[PDB]
Amino acid sequence: RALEALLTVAGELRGPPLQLDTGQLLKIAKRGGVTAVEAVHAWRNALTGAPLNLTPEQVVAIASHDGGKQALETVQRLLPVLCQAHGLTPQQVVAIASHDGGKQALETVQRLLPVLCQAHGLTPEQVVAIASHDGGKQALETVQALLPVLCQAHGLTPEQVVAIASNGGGKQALETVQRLLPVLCQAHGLTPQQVVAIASNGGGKQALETVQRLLPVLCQAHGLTPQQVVAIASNGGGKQALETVQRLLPVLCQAHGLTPQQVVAIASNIGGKQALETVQRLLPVLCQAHGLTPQQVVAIASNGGGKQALETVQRLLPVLCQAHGLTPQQVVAIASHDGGKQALETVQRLLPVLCQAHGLTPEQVVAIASNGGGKQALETVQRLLPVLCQAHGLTPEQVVAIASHDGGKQALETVQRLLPVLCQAHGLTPQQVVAIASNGGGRPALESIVAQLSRPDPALAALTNDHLVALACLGGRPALDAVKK
DNA sequence: GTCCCTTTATCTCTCT
DNA sequence: AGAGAGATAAAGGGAC
């Protein structure tokens, strides 16, 4: 009988000061719950207004987790203390809240930040890193606790300790390293380095126990070099890829004619369990009715979310080749990255619109879709290729060159925003800008140049605008950063 | 309902 | 340009 108030509330959030859309109320109501939704509406005016000055997106980002209400009340209370007593940016405060049990991680940060920063020479960037996950305060307490005994007695660096703690379940990972480090750097014969690689992913603990167990087994059985097994486990949810390999290695090996190199090459990714399993269902069909080769199959499988890519290829190769006229070779190009499934769906959807009101060739389209975030780049091209070419004096071929990299989208937006100030204000030519953006690292290379030009370092005017440009072209921000030094 | 841990998908940047 | 590193986020599930 309260459903009336609930809906009235979730109808009133649709206006000021928050103006939320369906999918956001859905996001909150989902992960945050009825009580997150209600709290949001209570503090809409208090969260938005000074001194907190939060944004709608920020407020959703907090609310939409187990704890939403708690984390909202906590953030309201602590943001000022964290920023003014502890020199944190509101951004960082938000990143820490935006997880399950915000309240815990915030409070624990406020408490431990001094003693970790002072007494344990950590930087607030690092502490923020560790708090910014689920169970952040477990992580925090376990770092406070174990950092000495881990650095001194086990011989680690604090950067490694930080790296292991900056996953969800960092607590468990720290303790598990503390336990098993000796029983691996000696008993199966591994670098720390390797162990550290293993423990620095979520489920690092699981991956650690699992290896501790199977490294003697799997490495003197199926013939895996132990380097290969580390490879496998020093990845997302390794555990599962380790067992899944223990099962499916001989099979796919003998029953599917797969070399251990490729099985290993598949499991050596996030969700490798799913990649191995799905390759075991679908390796056939794919090579039978689709003509694809085992090589190309392994290929599609050896990026992250292999299973999505595989299944989307099995479902979309024919309609793609048959209707939109693409080669199997091209389809494999588009699938052979992370988010492949997405890349494919977006192509199939967009090849039409793109190759028409934009005059884009299918080859340009497949070029765009054949990198990570391919779908992002596509959508961004579709949105901007009008805005750009026209009211900014570019050509489709250039827009294509800017999209045709990882971060295609970041690059296209950054260009949209910075073209004016760089061309005019600092006297650069569009060919230059385009040169720079047309690499992976576009966004930051642009930003790093624009910065270098608007607040030009006094002992950096040794170099010419065109030398800078040559350098952002060469190695983006990394290279313009190796100058300001 | 709040808090913690695991696994899986996706996206972006770096370094040569 | 491709392998590596890094980072963002959702979807499980267990515990009290």
Instruction: Name the protein residue, with chain letter, whose CA is nearest the C1' of C10.
Output: A31
Of the candidates A396, A349, A398, the one whose C-alpha atom is nearest the C-alpha of residue A374 is A349
Q: Residue A451, CB, less than 7 Å from strand B?
A: no
Q: Indicate yes or no: strand B within 7 A of the C-beta of A334.
A: no
Measured from the Cβ of residue A182, the count of other Cβ atoms closer than 10 Å reads 10
Structure tokens at A238: 């390794």
The one-letter code for the residue type at A190 is L
Instruction: Find out whether A364 and A399 touch, Cβ atoms under 8 Å.
Output: no
Q: Which nucleotides of C are covered by protein (CB under 7 A)?
A: 1-11, 13
**Residue A82 and residue A95 in contact, taking contact as beta carbons nearer than 8 Å:** no
Tell whether the torsion through CA atoms of A318, A322, A324 and A328 is positive or negative.
positive
How many angstroms separate the CA of A372 from the C1' of C3? 13
Integer angstrom CA distances of residue A163 from A129, A142, A200, A270: 9, 13, 6, 18
| Burial of A69 (C-beta count, 10 Å sphere; 0-12/13-18/19+) | buried
Nucleotide nearest to A441 (CA to C1'): B13
**Way it was determined:** X-ray
Closest CA to A303 of A247, A341, A260: A341
Minimum CA–C1' distance nucleotide for A38? B1
Phi, psi of A156 (to 5 degrees): -105, 170
8 A C-beta contact, residue A269 and residue A275: yes
- Comparing every residue's Cα with the C1' atom of nucleotide B16, the nearest one is A475
Amino acid letter, residue A104: Q
User: What are the tokens at A461?
Assistant: 């005017």
Domain locations along chain A:
1-485
CA distance A465 to A454: 12
Instruction: Say how far residue A236 (Cα) sits from the centre of its chain.
Output: 12
Tokens representing A168 are: 């969800």
Instruction: Report how far residue A439's alpha carbon sits from residue A373's, in angstroms, rounded to the nearest whole number.
Output: 14
The answer to whether strand B lies under 7 Å from the CB of residue A146 is no
Which one-letter amino acid corresponds to residue A125?
E
As given in the structure block, the two tokens for residue A213 are 């167990």
- The separation, in Å, between residue A160 CA and nucleotide B7 C1' comes to 23
> Which contacts (CB < 8 Å, 24+ apart) does range A25-31 have?
A27/A60, A27/A64, A28/A60, A28/A63, A28/A64, A28/A68, A30/A64, A31/A64, A31/A65, A31/A66, A31/A68
Q: Within 383-442 of chain A, which residues have Cβ less than 7 Å from strand B?
A: 406-411, 440-442
Q: CB-based contacts of A240: which residues, under 8 Å, 6+ apart?
A: A272, A273
SS3 per-residue string spanning chain A: CCHHHHHHHHHHCCCCCCCCCHHHHHHHHHHHCHHHHHHHHHCHHHHHCCCCCCCHHHHHHHHCCCCHHHHHHHHHHHHHHHHHHCCCCHHHHHHHHCCCCHHHHHHHHHHHHHHHHCCCCCCHHHHHHHHCCCCHHHHHHHHHHHHHHHHCCCCCCHHHHHHHHCCCCHHHHHHHHHHHCHHHHCCCCCCHHHHHHHHCCCCHHHHHHHHHHHHHHHHCCCCCCHHHHHHHHCCCCHHHHHHHHHHHHHHHHHCCCCCHHHHHHHHCCCCHHHHHHHHHHHHHHHHHCCCCCHHHHHHHHCCCCHHHHHHHHHHHHHHHHHCCCCCHHHHHHHHCCCCHHHHHHHHHHHHHHHHHHCCCCHHHHHHHHCCCCHHHHHHHHHHHHHHHHHHHCCCHHHHHHHHCCCCHHHHHHHHHHHHHHHHCCCCCCHHHHHHHHCCCCHHHHHHHHHHHHHCCCHHHCCCCHHHHHHHHHHHHHHHHHCCCC
The contacts of residue A116 (CB under 8 Å, 6+ apart) are: A122, A127, A140, A143, A144
Judged by C1' against the alpha carbon of A231, the nearest nucleotide is C4
Task: Answer for the pair A466, A474: CB distance below 8 angstroms, yes or no.
Answer: no
Return positions of chain B under 7 A from a protein CB. Answer: 1-16
CB A72 within 8 A of CB A43: yes
A405 Cβ partners below 8 Å, 6+ apart? A371, A411, A438, A439, A440, A442
Question: What residue has token string 């292999």?
Answer: A306
Closest residue by Cα to the C1' atom of nucleotide B6? A203
Amino acid code (one letter) for A428 = L
Using CA atoms, how far apart are residues A121 and A329, in angstroms rounded to an integer?
Answer: 53
Distance CA A43 to C1' B14 in A: 42
Residue with nearest Cα to nucleotide B9 C1': A305
Would you say the C-alpha torsion A43, A44, A50, A51 has a positive or negative sign? positive
Residues, chain A: 485
Nearest Cα neighbor of A83 from A64, A96, A66, A70 is: A96
| Cα–Cα distance, A292 to A309 (Å, whole number) | 14
Closest CA to A360 of A400, A390, A301, A321: A400
Resolution in A: 2.8
**CA-CA distances (angstroms) from residue A205 to A174, A421, A428?**
8, 49, 52
Name the nt closest to A65 by C-alpha to C1'. Answer: B2
Query: A108-111 long-range CB contacts below 8 Å, 24 or more apart?
Result: A108/A136, A108/A137, A108/A140, A108/A141, A109/A82, A109/A136, A109/A137, A109/A140, A110/A78, A110/A81, A110/A82, A110/A85, A110/A86
Whose structure tokens read 């190769």?
A317
- Asked if omega into A430 is within 30° of 0 (cis), the reply is no
Residues 176-235 of A with CB under 7 A from strand B: 202-207
Cα A446 to chain centroid distance, Å, stands at: 21
- Give me the phi and psi of A118, to 5 degrees please: -65, -85
Task: Determine the Cα–Cα distance for residues A168 and A390; give it in Å rounded to an integer.
Answer: 46
Cα(A233)–Cα(A194) distance, rounded to whole angstroms? 10
